[PDB]
């Protein structure tokens, strides 16, 4: 068995100005039931997240060691957290939900039938038999229940077979029939070696005398810990007789609780202080600071099992959810239909050219801006990304290639085909076969550069709200340096390196160097030269000359040579924006 | 006292096929304290949600009735309802969401430092007083605790002192001391007269034996109901014998959960449909449903007290969250630094009109993607706003008009003053007095069209990932009939009619209007007459004349009254779909 043991444990949080919650705690953990109990606000998540390894180590004080070792690195491959708050994905299923976690946290020896064969086991031990083809909710459609949610929550973190498992009161929620048998099969699972530290609230008397391990938060600071059954025996020396009270645990709280000024207006030298102070002169503080002195990532599946589950689970959302893809791909034709109505049958003529320079703008800008939808990817979902990252189910890389494929596919592949496509047959570009693949690569690659920079801007972030912003303003900025309104050779020095940063200047020069070059639109001409006066822009190459554009076949594919290098260092920037985001 | 009442009350809800919720329910809850007991799944929440009107009624299958008559229209401006999963404010304080929710659901009759005085008294009845002016947390950044944060809940709907007081399971989350203290604040509160209905799971006996009125729910179904001190003894008719438990709470759902399938994997004609048999032939049955036939919006404070709080929260939000606000003037700066670099010194010669024409448009254009930002302003806070109507804090056109106020001054008017003043000391543009507010006045009129256009697609929405995707590709689509890049006069007539859609083609009709009136630019003369050739565009008259410009003083207030019927035709889409929203 594990057991885990934590020493001087102190922590502070700042509000600047710190906060002393869980001032000195000591105490071991050995395998079997360990309850915490105490009253609300006196540190039970707090000390539960230090010893789960969850709390930012700038105001932490202490060590927590299993065994007499500090913490590997595979300790949240190797334990489980049940949290307080029940972070589910209420878009899939309660099976659903426990196929995703027996997927990335049992390990890939075990067949995917017989890992179903065990998840069947866990909805009948924990009693979801008419839910478990049921949606967990969201906050917006209602599903399970609240008590149902919890135990979708507790048999998440219980199909993986942890060997030191935290539960952050599992049992809120629940009634006191099904809170019996939940700690009844963690009592089961206790005595095959398993490690179980808990915080408890109203625990009835079937309930406590389940319990190995006794710890009683207060304020910050410990009031009792030891054995459950010496505890009761403990307070009798320290003045205070039970029987008033058929329940030991209704007995405790009511003495340690008795300074909170709810208690003192409701049917009624601090108590603390003087509490605290009898437990470290006791005989149960020094024995534990006399034992813990002789005591004192390599994920479980591969990168490619997780890559193949998290884009499978985020495209179930897409086809169970699919409002901003359909939506995408309407006003994609709709679009695409108008600009070739407009430009309908493009002429070689004078004015043939800024018909065909004008269009080739509006295909490039509608790309760019289509992506400001993309700064929703990772900012929805940093909740459950924070908590399924910490609990071990994946790696950055994984979840982060995986959600790149359901917002590359559906949204930027998948509409710049049908928006290619549908001003081809209408418009009349340059007719060839190759030069539509080109027309369709390069509006990919504006729509892939700007998805980039939408995730650049916006992994890690909670809200939306600066990250629109931010890219809309940039697009604005970068649509200036485009080369179409303003020159960019007439631009000053200081100001003309600025066009190299444009994702619309690569697209519309790629487009107009596919387009134009080959063309011909001053026939139509006289025994004079050719009548109008710029004096005429015959050639479709000496438009290119007069933009700037390069001749070459180097000339075209330089600008998608560096939309891949944007893409590469916006999807980098993303990428550790995810990795190195504070998910304490 | 309040005399609810429901009888034959049946639910569904659809998942399409139906689930049947919530069966045949009957009964009677009178003024005292009235506690509903039963298993997690039982239809406790889904029983205590038709009791406060906030189920849908077309699944809803009875009648509840306060005192023998329907409930009123300010029947949530007269009860009060804790919900099971706390949606509180997490940017602001345990003080200041309970300084909220009494300034706008008691009467302005009482002084705001006696409202105040009654905030103290109920922090301190409910032991909230270390984290009274702490910070109730969001879910990245924790603060207050989970009990900590049930208590404010509790206590928000407490200062409005309501007659008839919902509470979804008030004490989860509360240890067993803090929950006796609660439940003996609410026994003190019945006392007085008010009817006070709630779920609770697990109660201890101290908890138990304050209850007036005892119902269960088991599957839907009705197992028990009628006084709680009758309760034991109407299962030892059935066969049940009490006291191998010293709690009865703990002996009744052990018999309504024995068919569990948790408990029966776990230390060991259905029981259901016995139970529920049992119940309608006894003699608690008889005396409610022969009790049940002799029995068979107004808001507190008024609109402007309630427009003068949704914006004084809205402002201390953005105060404390200045994120959005500090980059929206930040990039507007460098924006306008970039626009007035580039076209720095704009001169009256043959290429000085594309140049003034060609700055208007990029000032056009980022009013108009700068509005997409106004997307997630009803969408971020759609829990709670759908949350705090319900709860008769608030109108819906108080709350639209106080959350305008947050987006139109801040990010909208503010950013549209500096950005005029940047390009117009660093331009040379138009420089009268006048031409200056003029367009200071344009640049708003589109910021504010464009964003009132980002309220009409998102409001009443979850995510806003539909709702940028159509805000972006809108504005693509009304920056072709902008008249800049393709000739309006020149596209045929059954397209032509979009250009009267598209907001920038009023404000860069407005700002070409009053730049390029009384210019000139064919200055710079030979004896000859100018000596370039298209031939000739000397006036600005003559340019506006092209573009199909209106010269009158009426061509300019043409597209600001034509954006002012923009924003109030958005404004109202956006507030009906507000208020036409589903919110149970
Ligand atoms: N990061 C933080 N910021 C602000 N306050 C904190 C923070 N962490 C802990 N606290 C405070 O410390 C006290 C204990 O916190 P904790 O969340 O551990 O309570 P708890 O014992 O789990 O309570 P409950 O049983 O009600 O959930 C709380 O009163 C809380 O307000
Ligand atoms: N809108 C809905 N969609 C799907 N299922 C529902 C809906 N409403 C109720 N249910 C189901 O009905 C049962 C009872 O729902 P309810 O939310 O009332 O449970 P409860 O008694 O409050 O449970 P708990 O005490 O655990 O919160 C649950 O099992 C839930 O799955
Ligand atoms: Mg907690
Ligand atoms: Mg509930």
């Given at each position: 068995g594990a057991v885990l043991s934590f020493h001087n444990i102190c922590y502070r949080v700042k509000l600047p100005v710190?906060?002393?919650?869980?001032s000195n705690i000591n105490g071991i953990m050995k395998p079997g039931l360990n309850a915490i109990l105490g009253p609300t606000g006196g540190g039970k998540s707090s000390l539960l997240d230090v010893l789960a390894a969850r709390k930012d180590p700038s105001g932490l004080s202490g060590d927590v060691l299993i065994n007499g070792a500090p913490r590997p690195a595979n300790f949240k491959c190797n334990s489980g957290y049940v949290v307080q708050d029940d972070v589910v994905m209420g878009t899939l299923t309660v099976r659903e939900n426990l196929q995703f976690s027996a997927a990335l946290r049992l390990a890939t020896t075990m067949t995917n039938h017989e890992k179903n064969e065990r998840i069947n086991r866990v909805i009948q031990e924990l009693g979801l038999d008419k839910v478990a083809d049921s949606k967990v909710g969201t906050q917006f459609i209602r599903g399970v229940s609240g008590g149902e949610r919890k135990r979708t929550s507790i048999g998440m973190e219980l199909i993986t077979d942890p060997s030191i498992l935290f539960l952050d009161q599992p049992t809120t929620g629940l009634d006191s029939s099904t809170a019996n048998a939940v700690l009844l099969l963690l009592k089961r699972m206790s005595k095959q070696g398993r490690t179980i530290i808990f915080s408890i609230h109203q625990p009835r008397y079937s309930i406590f005398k389940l319990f190995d391990s006794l710890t009683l938060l207060a304020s910050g600071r410990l009031m009792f810990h030891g054995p459950a059954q010496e505890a009761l025996g403990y307070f009798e020396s320290a003045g205070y007789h039970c029987e008033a009270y058929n329940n030991p645990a209704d007995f405790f709280l009511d003495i340690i609780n008795g300074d909170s000024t709810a208690v003192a207006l409701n049917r009624e030298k601090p108590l603390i202080e003087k509490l605290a102070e009898i437990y470290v002169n006791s005989s149960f503080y020094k024995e534990t600071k006399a034992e813990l002195h002789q005591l004192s990532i390599s994920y479980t599946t591969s990168f490619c099992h997780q890559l193949r589950?998290?884009?499978?689970?985020?495209?179930?959302?897409?086809?169970?959810?699919?409002?901003?893809?359909?939506?995408?791909?309407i006003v994609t034709v709709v679009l695409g239909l108008v600009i070739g109505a407009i430009y309908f049958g493009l002429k070689n003529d004078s004015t043939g050219i800024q018909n065909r320079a004008g269009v080739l703008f509006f295909l490039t800008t509608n790309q760019c801006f289509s992506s400001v939808s993309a700064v929703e990817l990772f900012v929805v979902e940093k909740k459950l990304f924070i908590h399924e990252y910490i609990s071990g189910y994946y790696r950055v890389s994984s979840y982060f290639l995986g959600k790149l494929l359901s917002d590359l596919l559906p949204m930027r592949m998948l509409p710049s085909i049908i928006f290619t496509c549908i001003v081809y047959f209408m418009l009349g570009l340059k007719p060839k076969a190759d030069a539509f693949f080109v027309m369709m690569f390069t509006l990919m690659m504006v729509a892939y550069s700007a998805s980039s920079m939408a995730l650049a801007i916006a992994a890690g972030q909670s809200v939306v709200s600066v990250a629109t912003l931010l890219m809309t303003i940039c697009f604005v900025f970068m649509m200036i340096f485009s080369g179409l309104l303003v020159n960019l050779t007439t631009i000053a020095s200081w100001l003309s390196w600025l066009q190299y940063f444009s994702i619309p200047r690569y697209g519309f020069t790629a487009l107009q160097h596919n387009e134009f070059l080959g063309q011909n639109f001053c026939p139509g001409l006289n025994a004079t030269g050719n009548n109008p006066c710029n004096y005429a822009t015959c050639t479709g190459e000496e438009y290119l000359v007069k933009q700037g554009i390069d001749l070459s076949p180097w000339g075209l594919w330089?600008?998608?040579?560096?939309?891949?290098?944007?893409?590469?260092?916006?999807?980098?920037?993303?990428?550790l924006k995810l990795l190195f985001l504070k998910k304490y």
């Open positions: 710190e906060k002393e919650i869980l589950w998290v884009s499978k689970r985020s495209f179930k959302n897409l086809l169970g959810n699919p409002q901003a893809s359909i939506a995408q791909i330089k600008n998608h040579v560096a939309l891949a290098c944007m893409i590469v260092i916006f999807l980098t920037i993303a990428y």
